[PDB]
Ligand binder design. Structure first.
Ligand SMILES: *[C@H](CC(=O)NNc1cnccn1)n1cnc(-c2cc(C(F)(F)F)cc(C(F)(F)F)c2)n1
Lengths: 85, 236, 106, 817
């Protein structure tokens, strides 16, 4: 029901398996996953995106913008490339 | 109405404009229709544009409706003129009285090359004019009319990659013209109902943070791999 | 209608959601189902302010507009150890690297 | 000086007839220019004189022509430098200067049109030639209609010459661009949005030739002008209108792919312009221009289904516009598109679930809610074309049933009301509605064709009923208030209803396919409703269409209606004959329809004449004789044709042929000879020769089988010879007996060769005319008008081979799919 993702700095994020499978890499690789290059401040945003994508899939109303700060945009893009998101 | 330099620009002869400028001609002089010689040069040829720019011509000169020469170069689809103007300091997001940017005019007619160059120089796709139109909306209006070809489809793909996510539905219904086309309506509803991949949104954020630059040069200095550098430039 | 929460404790983070009308007891039940701790040895904090278990989640500071899927509302968590409650400890996420010169505002 | 001017004018008057020796051999060709042309007083006429010389078109004397051109060009350069603005000079110039400019244009045009090849083969004069062309461009800027017509004549000639050869084009290449601009800049108004028609046709032909010479240049010019319209510079309603007329008039000249590119760019620019402009006036102007553009180029609409659907939907939108003229233009464009792209509305297109015709039919009531009655008729005709494009019979039947639903229900309501109370047929609103419904039915029948029998049979019996009622209403009114009551609006509304009924019947029957069904089902009720009503009405109340209708039926049913002909004649013939023969300007339509019916009966149902009573047959012959003795050309021609066909037909009725000969041969021969000798119908001379040659041949072969002499037997040949000789002598007593005898013998011998017979008769008549002071030119009219016709044919055959010269909707050679 729940999967646990470990950040490079040791932070642990527990998310619903359905949300986690949004990432092709996670689905292919999987009750726990570990990343050696994704920092916590990026993995938290990735989990936020999992929730946001699951909520607003096939929505009939306007989908609100996903907030990405310029500081993490580069690392977030790299992480999204590593995953399949 | 118009002055000899304007006529030289209209007839598209670099020699005449160059020799006229060689005797201190008023390069930024207005005329009967409130345009400048650079407007005609942008509308006509890139050699005249280069000659005029070499002699201090203002690349952001305004006309009766506050349209810069870049607006007309993009509308005419003079890709070389667009590149020459942008390379000399032209504003890529200049707004006219209707709040129409050059990219909006380029997308109105589905000009692929001009759109590509404007995006390469940091043009904003998430822009709306006074009557609520956006470049993607205008391109879709062109497409639903049946006047589009493979070039227009490629332009739509480019704009879709550049925008990240778009919404054409007012309230919860597509416009009347789109709604009456079962195929394009289905395609656009499927596109508009998807939140958007994280990679696309991150690319949009990175590009926006780079705004108003020659993006292919800027991305060269980033620590990204080659594949992500190509991705950031809408090449995939 | 629905409020999205990010329960936090030390390095552990749980992304979840609940109805605004739901009570804190159900949230503690979810925390049990995740970390396997009795609710009697759990206590939740909203901005270093203790939350009474009886209060419904809506009447607290959590609201649908404030807590969205793309911006969940943090909820600190504390367990009971040796017949005592530990101090609320939340480990901040790693700081992002300095913005490169090219990406800085003009 | 006045004596010199008078002498020059007299020379100009007589210059045409003077032998070329006195013109091109003397010193005149230089005296006129070095002695008078420099002097304004004798300038104009002098220049005019030169023009006449340039028009001689003599094979020899090349050096004289070259010297004339060179010296005249130098003189004109001296007295009118090429740097001048001819437009302003003509505008503000006095009468003398305007006349001089006109004469200069005339001289240049005529001399170039005559000897351009002569002038341009000299390498030394090349520059001067271009100079001349410059003048022709300069003068072409004058706004006056006559000067521009003169210039356009030469421009059209040059364009046709250059196109024909494919070179020589390289000689005119560096300047043709200018001409193109002119053609696009001064384009005339097409008769889709006399002197004006000719001007537009000439401009279109010249522009089509020029675009055929260079597609890229034409596309560049038009696109640049359209952009200039878009960017504000040189924007104006008239400029936009002329540019769009020029774009439309090119349709068909370009290849399909180049046309595709050009039209896509033009449409995008026009849509951008429409978005840019604000205000109802500007938007309406742009919409009308786009409507005209898309009205042409049916090929592009055919190749692009989505754009065609969008255009049709936009036309439906415009149909609700209250702005003046927008609805008419929308309906015209819709009918054009429906005619040229009919098959694309009935078949299912790519990406569609059902054909567009179903969608149009479902929403028909909503589309035409704001249209005027004539616009509604046009819309129904346009839809009928598409419905008729449907090949499958059952689907077409269902389409027709849905097509006439609203008219059918209004008609049914009116019919039920009339059944409840007949007086409703006297209500003006009801009569007007019936007329409108019948007009819609007529247009639908015209568009659909034979399958419309499904609709016609639905209402036929009711229609003929209403007809009768309305007739009964009119006859009463005339009986109560006299014939003047026929001017009343209600009476003419009822007569309009009757006319539309007859027009619908005729329109369907003319396109019928099964004569037996028409004869069995439709003819009897029609005759019962129409015949006696026509007979008993006063001349001011009789409908001419009746006669026309009858003719149509007789042409389609033929032997299937030969049994009814006697009653048709009994009801119509004597009445219309008394109506028509009385005066030659009273009832033109009645006379035309009467002779059409007579011709149809004679051609297809001749045996009926045998069953007709002899007195009525005599009336028929008297009508024919009155017809071919008339003064008008058409009446005489139709009378002669009917007489010839009647003679040929009666030649096949052995039982009655002898009686017909013995009763009418001499009378017909005498009438024909009288009209021939009177020379009142020279245009029909050939026909006379066709008839007489036949008649004589009948006695030549002994086919008369009886003596034409009423008193005693005698050989028919000798009797006819003496009779015709006596006729000629009475007509021309002064002629000698031997001359008449030899002429008649030769004429009788040539009965087996129509051309020789006609030439002999023509020679005799020419000699007769020359004996007096009469002119023999008229006798040869039959020749000249033929030659003219031939020329026209050639012209037409020349223009069909050049794509784009003819309007896409004018060519009957519709393509497939
Ligand atoms: C004004 C401009 C307008 O209403 N819409 N602009 C568009 C439409 N579609 C795509 C892009 N921009 N305006 C005035 N008249 C027209 C118009 C007329 C016709 C005609 F054929 F009926 F004359 C057709 C169309 C078209 F292209 F089918 F939409 C537009 N537009």
């Amino acid at each position: 029901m729940y999967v646990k993702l470990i950040s490079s700095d040791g932070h642990e994020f527990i998310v619903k398996r359905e949300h986690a499978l949004t990432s092709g890499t996670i689905k292919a690789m999987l009750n726990e996953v570990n990343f050696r290059e994704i920092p916590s401040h990026v993995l938290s945003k990735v989990c936020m995106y999992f929730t946001y994508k699951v909520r607003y899939t096939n929505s009939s109303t306007e989908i609100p913008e996903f907030p990405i700060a310029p500081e993490i945009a580069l690392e977030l893009l790299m992480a999204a490339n590593f995953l399949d998101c | 109405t118009l002055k000899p330099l304007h006529c030289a620009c209209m007839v598209s002869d670099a020699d005449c404009v160059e020799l006229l400028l060689e005797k201190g001609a008023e390069v930024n002089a207005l005329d009967g229709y409130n345009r400048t010689a650079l407007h005609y040069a942008a509308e006509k040829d890139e050699a005249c544009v280069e000659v005029l720019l070499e002699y201090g011509a203002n690349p952001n000169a305004l006309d009766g409706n506050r349209d810069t020469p870049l607006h007309w170069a993009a509308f005419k689809n003079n890709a070389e003129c667009v590149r020459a103007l942008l390379e000399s300091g032209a504003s890529v997001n200049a707004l006219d009285y209707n709040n129409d940017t050059p990219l909006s005019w380029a997308a109105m007619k589905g000009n692929l090359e001009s759109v590509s160059i404007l995006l390469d120089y940091g043009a904003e796709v998430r822009v709306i004019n006074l009557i609520g139109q956006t470049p993607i909306s205008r391109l879709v209006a062109l497409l639903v009319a049946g006047l589009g070809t493979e070039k227009e489809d490629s332009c739509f793909e480019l704009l879709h990659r550049a925008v990240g996510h778009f919404e054409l539905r007012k309230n919860g219904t597509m416009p009347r013209e789109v709604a009456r086309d079962p195929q394009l309506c289905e395609k656009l509803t499927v596109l508009c109902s998807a939140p958007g991949t994280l990679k696309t949104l991150a690319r949009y954020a990175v590009r926006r943070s780079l705004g108003l630059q020659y993006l292919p040069d800027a991305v060269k200095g980033l620590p990204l791999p080659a594949s992500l550098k190509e991705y950031l430039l809408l090449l995939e | 209608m629905d409020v999205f929460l990010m329960i936090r404790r030390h390095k552990t983070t749980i992304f979840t959601d609940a109805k605004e009308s739901s009570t804190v007891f159900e949230l503690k039940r979810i925390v049990e189902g995740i970390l396997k701790r009795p609710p009697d040895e759990q206590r939740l904090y909203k901005d270093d302010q203790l939350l009474d278990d009886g209060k419904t989640l809506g009447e607290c500071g959590f609201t649908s507009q404030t807590a969205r899927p793309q911006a969940p509302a943090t909820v600190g968590l504390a367990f009971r150890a040796d017949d005592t409650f530990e101090a609320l400890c939340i480990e901040p996420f790693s700081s992002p690297p300095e913005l490169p010169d090219v990406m800085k505002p003009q | 000086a006045p004596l010199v001017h008078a002498t020059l004018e007299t020379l100009l008057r007589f210059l045409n007839w003077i032998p070329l020796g006195y013109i091109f051999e003397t010193k005149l060709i230089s005296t006129l220019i070095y002695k008078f042309l420099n002097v304004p007083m004798f300038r104009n006429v002098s220049l005019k004189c030169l023009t006449e010389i340039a028009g001689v078109s003599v094979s020899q004397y090349e050096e004289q022509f070259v010297t004339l051109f060179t010296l005249t060009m130098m003189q004109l350069k001296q007295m009118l430098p090429l740097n001048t603005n001819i437009r302003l000079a003509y505008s503000n110039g006095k009468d003398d200067e305007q006349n001089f400019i006109q004469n200069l244009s005339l001289f240049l045009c005529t001399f170039l049109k005559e000897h351009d090849q002569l002038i341009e083969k000299r390498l030394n004069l090349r520059e001067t030639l271009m100079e001349a062309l410059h003048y022709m461009l300069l003068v072409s800027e004058v706004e006056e209609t006559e000067i521009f017509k003169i210039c356009l004549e030469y421009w059209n000639h040059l364009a046709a010459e250059l196109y024909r050869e494919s070179p020589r084009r390289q000689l005119y290449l560096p300047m043709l661009f200018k001409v193109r601009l002119l053609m696009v800049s001064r384009m005339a108004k097409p008769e889709e949005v006399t002197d004006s028609i000719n001007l537009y046709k000439n401009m279109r032909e010249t522009l089509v030739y020029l675009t055929h010479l260079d597609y890229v240049d034409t596309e560049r010019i038009m696109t640049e002008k359209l952009h200039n319209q878009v960017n504000g510079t040189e924007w104006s309603w008239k400029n936009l209108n002329t540019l769009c007329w020029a774009i439309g008039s090119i349709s068909g000249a370009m290849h399909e792919e180049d046309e595709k590119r050009f039209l896509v760019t033009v449409i995008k620019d026009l849509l951008g312009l429409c978005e840019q402009k604000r205000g109802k006036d500007n938007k309406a102007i742009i919409a009308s221009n786009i409507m005209y553009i898309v009205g042409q180029y049916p090929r592009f609409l055919r190749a692009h289904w989505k754009f065609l659907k969008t255009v049709v939907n936009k036309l439906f939108e415009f149909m609700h516009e209250t702005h003046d003229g927008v609805q008419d233009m929308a309906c015209d464009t819709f009918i054009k598109i429906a005619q040229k792209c009919r098959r694309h509305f009935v078949q299912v297109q790519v990406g569609e679930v059902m054909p567009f015709i179903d969608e149009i039919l479902n929403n028909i009531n909503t589309i035409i809610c704001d249209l005027q009655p004539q616009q509604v008729h046009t819309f129904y005709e346009a839809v009928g074309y598409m419905i008729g494009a449907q090949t499958d019979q059952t689907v077409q039947e269902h389409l027709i049933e849905k097509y006439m639903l609203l008219p059918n229900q209004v008609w049914d309501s009116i019919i039920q009301q009339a059944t409840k109370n007949v007086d409703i047929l006297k209500d003006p609103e009801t009569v007007k509605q019936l007329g409108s419904i019948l007009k819609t039915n007529v247009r639908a029948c015209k568009a659909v064709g034979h399958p419309f029998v499904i609709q016609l049979g639905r209402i036929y019996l009711d229609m003929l009923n209403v007809y009768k009622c309305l007739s009964e209403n009119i006859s009463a009114a005339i009986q109560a208030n006299g014939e003047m009551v026929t001017k009343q609006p209600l009476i003419r509304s009822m007569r309009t209803v009757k006319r539309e009924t007859l027009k619908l019947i005729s329109g369907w029957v003319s396109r019928s396919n099964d004569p037996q069904m028409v004869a069995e089902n439709f003819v009897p009720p029609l005759l019962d409703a129409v015949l006696i009503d026509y007979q008993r009405n006063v001349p001011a109340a009789r409908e001419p269409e009746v006669l026309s209708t009858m003719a149509i039926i007789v042409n389609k049913l033929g032997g299937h209606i030969t049994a009814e002909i006697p009653q048709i004649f009994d009801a119509v013939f004597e009445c219309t004959l008394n109506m028509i023969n009385k005066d030659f300007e009273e009832y033109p339509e009645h006379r035309t329809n009467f002779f059409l019916l007579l011709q149809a009966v004679n051609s297809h149902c001749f045996p009926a004449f045998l069953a007709i009573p002899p007195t009525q047959f005599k009336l028929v012959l008297d009508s024919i004789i009155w017809a071919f003795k008339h003064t008008m050309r058409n009446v005489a021609d139709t009378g002669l044709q009917i007489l010839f066909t009647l003679l040929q037909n009666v030649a096949q009725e052995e039982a009655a042929a002898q009686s017909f000969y013995q009763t009418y041969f001499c009378d017909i021969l005498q009438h024909i000879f009288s009209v021939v000798t009177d020379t009142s119908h020279t245009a029909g001379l050939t026909m006379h020769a066709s008839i007489l040659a036949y008649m004589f041949n009948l006695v030549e072969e002994g086919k008369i089988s009886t003596s034409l002499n009423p008193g005693n037997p005698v050989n028919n040949q000798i009797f006819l010879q003496e009779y015709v000789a006596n006729l000629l002598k009475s007509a021309f007593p002064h002629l000698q007996d031997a001359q008449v005898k030899l002429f008649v013998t030769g004429l009788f011998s040539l009965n087996q060769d129509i051309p020789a017979f006609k030439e002999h008769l023509r020679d005799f008549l020419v000699q007769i005319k020359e004996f007096a002071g009469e002119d023999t030119s008229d006798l040869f009219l039959e020749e000249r008008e033929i030659a003219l016709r031939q020329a026209d044919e050639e012209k037409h055959k020349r223009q069909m081979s050049v794509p784009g010269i003819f309007n896409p909707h004018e060519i009957p050679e519709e393509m497939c799919d």
